[PDB]
Amino acid sequence: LLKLFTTMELMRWSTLVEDYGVELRKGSSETPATDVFSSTEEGEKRWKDLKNRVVEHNIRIMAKYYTRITMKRMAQLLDLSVDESEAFLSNLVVNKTIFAKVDRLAGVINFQRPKDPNNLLNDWSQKLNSLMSLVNKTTHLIAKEEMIHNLQ
């Protein structure tokens, strides 16, 4: 249960519920089946929340890692329809769980800010500066490796 969420990979509720259903509910604590908070009967009240959490997490990882994905691919993972996802998207962004913009076409999800001149500008400076720091550092290591004891 810990290992799946920690590794950022795309998943879906449909598989997640069935599997964990057998593990968590069965799990011997001190010794009994009971542990609650998404395991047993009482645990079911908390479990409902777990579904919502999978869908906030799927949209988050895809947002961070990718910059564009289609809305049809996104829905399959979340286990929503487009009309259902769209409602959910309006409230998520307001709390600031994620930043994402979805359309009605289901052509695309822009997980970046729209292509305005400032983002392009910003990246272009950062790319330049990193190279210059790296070329300096490598020359210092290289100098020892070359000369050495002067046995070669």
Binding site: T7, M8, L10, M11, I61, Y65, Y66, R68, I69
Partner: protein
């Protein structure tokens, strides 16, 4: 002092070839050549008594005690090591090894060596927690001192055995490489070396991590030693890279041999898919950023809805960086990892670098031309 020659003398007359080793020992102890006497005991245990004879251990107990200051701390360990191999019971060998150890003038690592010998016994018995613990402590002690030659070589090979038995691919790969720099032959048969090449080559295939394919060739261990099991291995290393689930499903016999694969069969048929991505992205990305995703899925020979999953995992760890854009069904790679210790790549970067050098010079003349008055 001389309680021990009295016993050697008696024994001296018997044994077919053991007689000779005995004659030398007595002559050297009287001269009081302490260096030469210690060097004779070493030879003595290995071919004679306790293989051809019996009762080397008993003779040894007497021998180390009194003679302790005439023998050196490293050596005492070495004599005991050979007999222990020969001992049929590891239990009785463990009893001796702990008690025997001592240290006098000319201070050394002798405690640590004696520990390696104990760790080897724990493997023989085959209780995994016990072997794991001995390996950790002794390793730490060995690792701090740079001085370790012989001891490191036998110990790393022993640990190597434990990591493939438990069945963990990552542990074996890191361990194997240290064994390669520290190598020696004290009592390292041809057989052990071959097991090491074969397991190492396989280790790189089992993980879902780093691409190890180019480097495997470079490393002397596999390259120097050959057999037909490994003849199968070389083909297999670039069978996942092209993407073939067939050039390893009939060379599939290699895994059967090792116990290393024991839950890395659930990582074998994940690695193939990462490798299909690794090949195309390495060549085409660099010059121009984007590449199609359609070629990589078909090479995988596994569906589209599960290839994305591994590829996302690869972006996450940082093995590769970039995005999957499903609006056009192509993969845009920002950065690609350069596979390490490949000769071809060095040639490739050199010619590029020279073009950059030109560019700097060309530009520099222009900047000075205008604003030269201001520059002075």
């Amino acid at each position: 002092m001389k309680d021990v020659p009295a016993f050697l003398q008696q024994s001296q007359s018997s044994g077919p070839g053991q007689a000779a080793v005995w004659h030398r020992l007595e002559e050297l102890y009287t001269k009081k050549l302490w260096h030469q006497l210690t060097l004779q005991v070493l030879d003595f245990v290995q071919d004679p008594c306790f293989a051809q004879g019996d009762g080397l251990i008993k003779l040894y107990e007497n021998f180390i005690s009194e003679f302790e200051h005439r023998v050196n701390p490293l050596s005492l360990v070495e004599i005991i090591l050979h007999v222990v191999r020969q001992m049929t019971d590891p239990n009785v060998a463990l009893t001796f090894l702990e008690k025997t150890r001592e240290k006098v003038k000319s201070s050394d690592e002798a405690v640590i060596l004696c520990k390696t010998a104990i760790g080897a016994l724990k493997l023989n018995i085959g209780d995994l927690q016990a072997t794991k613990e001995t390996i950790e402590d002794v390793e730490e002690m060995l690792n701090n001192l740079p001085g370790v030659t012989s001891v490191h070589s036998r110990f790393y090979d022993l640990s190597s055995k434990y990591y493939q038995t438990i069945g963990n691919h990552a542990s074996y790969y890191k361990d194997a490489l240290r064994f390669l720099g520290c190598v020696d032959i004290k009592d390292l048969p041809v057989s052990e070396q071959q097991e090491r090449a074969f397991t190492l080559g396989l280790a790189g295939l089992l993980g879902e991590g780093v691409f190890n394919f180019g480097e495997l060739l470079m490393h002397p261990v596999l390259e120097s030693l050959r057999n037909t099991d490994r003849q199968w291995l070389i083909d297999t290393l670039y069978a996942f890279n092209s993407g073939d689930v067939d050039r390893f499903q009939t060379l599939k016999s290699a895994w059967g041999q090792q116990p290393d694969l024991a839950a890395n069969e659930a990582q074998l048929l994940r690695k193939i898919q990462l490798l299909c991505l690794m090949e195309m992205t390495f060549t085409r990305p660099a010059n121009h950023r984007q590449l199609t995703f359609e070629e990589i899925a078909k090479s995988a020979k596994i569906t589209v809805n599960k290839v994305e999953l591994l590829v996302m995992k690869a972006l996450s760890v940082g093995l590769v960086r970039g995005s999957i854009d499903e609006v056009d069904k192509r993969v845009h790679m920002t950065w690609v990892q350069p596979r390490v210790l490949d000769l071809q790549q060095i040639k490739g970067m050199k010619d590029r670098l020279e073009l950059w050098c030109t560019d700097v010079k060309s530009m520099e003349l222009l900047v000075e031309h205008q604003a030269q008055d201001i520059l002075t």
